[PDB]
Design a protein around this ligand. Structure first.
Ligand SMILES: N=C(NCCCCCCNC(=N)NC(=N)Nc1ccc(Cl)cc1)NC(=N)Nc1ccc(Cl)cc1
Ligand SMILES: Nc1ncnc2c1ncn2[C@@H]1O[C@H](COP(=O)(O)OP(=O)(O)OP(=O)(O)O)[C@@H](O)[C@H]1O
Length: 519
């Protein structure tokens, strides 16, 4: 059977509209999923929404709507966005669904029964503008009384914090410390790069993992603990178990869970790596479940006032980009312009240049020039590939195969910007081959009709390579390119058809009415 590959995005918090930051993660996961399907894996790709907590209740109440009324509307918009981006997610998990809530309940009750969780009192220091709870050691300008911290200010904003106390269940995560460090040793690529792993260990694990406050009693909008109804399960357990609840864990049908768990890749931005690389494996250990194989963290899309944030309002709406510039342009920009190992600033000027110069100009003109020449010189009948007849062909056919090899290395290491630049080196060289060979000169005399046919064959086969390699990234252009070239054999759209250059060994009738590939 096909080997399974399970990839997840984070579940997003619908306290406001999603922005291109969210689209970046979801498109990234989609490219991985599409690539793995093309490599012959049995893929499951999950995304969804994190719907509980005070902030959601507040948003709903402000809008004059019930919590579920508010959420259903937000979720409809999120699902519409993923459909518009042509995301190939196999499921959409909502934490309000009973399939999820059942797992949250059962996990919590199991940990209580085992004694991993016990009843205590949560204490935190709340800052209104930061919407954050701090520990006493994080406070700046700490005020003391009888050798005990009684007040302070937020380290982020400097706003006066307020002491909050409430009954809360705690999960003793520190018991699992040695097992977690052992796991990191046995799985050296679980967290990357090495600096990030050291970061996790030194900042959080080393000084000692504090007990984790896994319930709250001060609000009602969440999953209630069956054995103690006045407690609601907090973010840690509720959100993290989405990755297993979506697979039917602890349901009447665990077949998806039995197949796909453990996840091959959990994808996220850097700020939630700690939760996925410490809390999540510890929770899984407490449940006697296999751990995920890899946490993949990318950087932030920034604006010129910091990280793009829906609560801040410094946002770019992907719907606006798609509506104005098209889907291929939007997906291309996200994957090409913003490497995962860096934070990058969005600008409209960079978006426009990237999509006009690379898509419409470089690739789009290559296809139109090529088809136009086939129609002009051979009345639409593309001559069959024969061999490397032109002087430049040997080296260019070698470049095609090297392009596939390099691309594969980049894709395997999740260096998508590099994979794309590598494909574009080949596209640009194919345009240069038109200029070098000057087909119009060869079309002057019937003595060169054979060589002209060879040049046309090489342009089309180069285009085919590019189109196949772009199938994980672009959902419209490759299909359109195959349709205009009238390559109908589904096999010639797959990676295996790139092993040996020159598959089109019969003549084909290209389109007589070519049209722009983009937008
Ligand atoms: N937006 C949230 N803020 C509180 C997060 C904890 C402290 C913040 C730590 N720093 C962050 N920046 N975290 C973050 N933005 N999201 C997050 C994502 C995954 C996990 Cl497991 C934990 C937190 N919570 C949320 N997404 N879900 C939630 C679910 C159930 C209930 Cl009852 C209440 C809330
Ligand atoms: N600016 C961004 N750059 C890259 N990814 C992002 C960005 N914003 C959100 N994401 C994706 O969404 C996930 C959750 O981010 P979250 O929605 O908490 O950020 P946010 O938009 O700042 O939210 P809030 O404004 O409510 O704090 C991230 O882990 C990441 O996968």
């Amino acid at each position: 059977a096909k080997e399974t590959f399970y990839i997840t995005t984070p579940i997003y918090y619908p306290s406001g509209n999603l922005h291109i930051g969210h689209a970046y993660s979801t498109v990234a996961g989609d490219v991985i999923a599409r690539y793995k399907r093309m490599q012959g894996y049995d893929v499951r790709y999950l995304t969804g929404t994190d719907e509980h907590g005070q902030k959601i209740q507040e948003k709903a109440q402000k809008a004059g709507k019930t919590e579920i009324e508010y959420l259903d509307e937000m979720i409809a918009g999120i699902k519409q966005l993923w459909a518009k981006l042509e995301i190939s997610n196999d499921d959409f998990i909502r934490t309000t669904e009973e399939r999820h809530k059942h797992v949250v309940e059962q996990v919590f009750e199991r940990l209580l029964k085992q004694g991993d969780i016990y009843l205590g009192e949560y204490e935190g220091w709340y800052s209104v503008p930061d919407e954050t709870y701090y520990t006493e050691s994080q406070l700046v300008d700490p005020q003391y009384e009888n050798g005990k911290i009684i007040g302070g200010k937020s380290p982020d904003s400097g706003h006066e914090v307020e002491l909050v106390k409430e009954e809360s269940y705690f999960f003793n995560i520190s018991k699992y410390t040695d097992r977690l460090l052992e796991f990191y040793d046995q799985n050296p690529d679980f967290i990357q790069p090495p600096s990030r792993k050291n970061e996790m260990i030194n900042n959080f694990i080393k000084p000692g993992l504090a007990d984790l406050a896994v319930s709250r009693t001060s609000f009602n909008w969440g999953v209630h603990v069956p054995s103690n109804p006045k407690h609601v399960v907090y973010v840690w357990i509720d959100a993290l178990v989405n990755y297993i609840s979506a697979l039917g864990y602890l349901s009447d049908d665990e077949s998806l869970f039995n197949k796909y768990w453990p996840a091959d890749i959990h994808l996220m931005a850097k700020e939630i790596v700690r939760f996925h690389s410490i809390i999540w494996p510890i929770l899984l250990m407490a449940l006697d479940l296999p751990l995920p194989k890899k946490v993949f963290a990318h950087g932030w899309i920034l604006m010129k006032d910091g990280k793009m944030s829906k609560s801040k309002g410094n946002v770019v709406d992907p719907n606006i980009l798609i509506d104005r510039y098209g889907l291929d342009a939007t997906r291309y920009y996200l994957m090409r312009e913003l490497p995962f190992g860096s934070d990058g600033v969005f600008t409209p000027e960079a978006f426009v240049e990237r999509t006009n110069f690379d898509l419409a100009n470089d690739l789009g003109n290559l296809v139109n020039r090529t088809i136009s020449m086939v129609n002009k010189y051979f009345d639409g009948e593309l001559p069959a590939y024969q061999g490397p007849l032109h002087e430049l062909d040997e080296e260019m056919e070698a470049m095609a195969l090297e392009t596939v090899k390099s691309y594969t290395e980049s894709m395997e290491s999740l260096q998508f910007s590099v994979a794309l630049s590598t494909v574009w080196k080949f596209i640009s060289r194919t345009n240069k081959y038109i200029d070098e060979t000057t087909p119009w000169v060869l079309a002057k005399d019937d003595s060169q009709k054979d060589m002209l046919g060879n040049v046309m064959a090489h342009l089309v086969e180069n285009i085919r390579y590019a189109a196949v390699l772009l199938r994980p990234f672009l959902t419209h252009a490759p299909k359109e390119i195959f349709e205009q070239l009238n390559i109908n054999n589904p096999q010639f759209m797959e990676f295996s058809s790139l092993e040996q250059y020159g598959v089109l060994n019969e003549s084909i009738m290209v389109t007589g009415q070519p049209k722009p590939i983009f937008p």
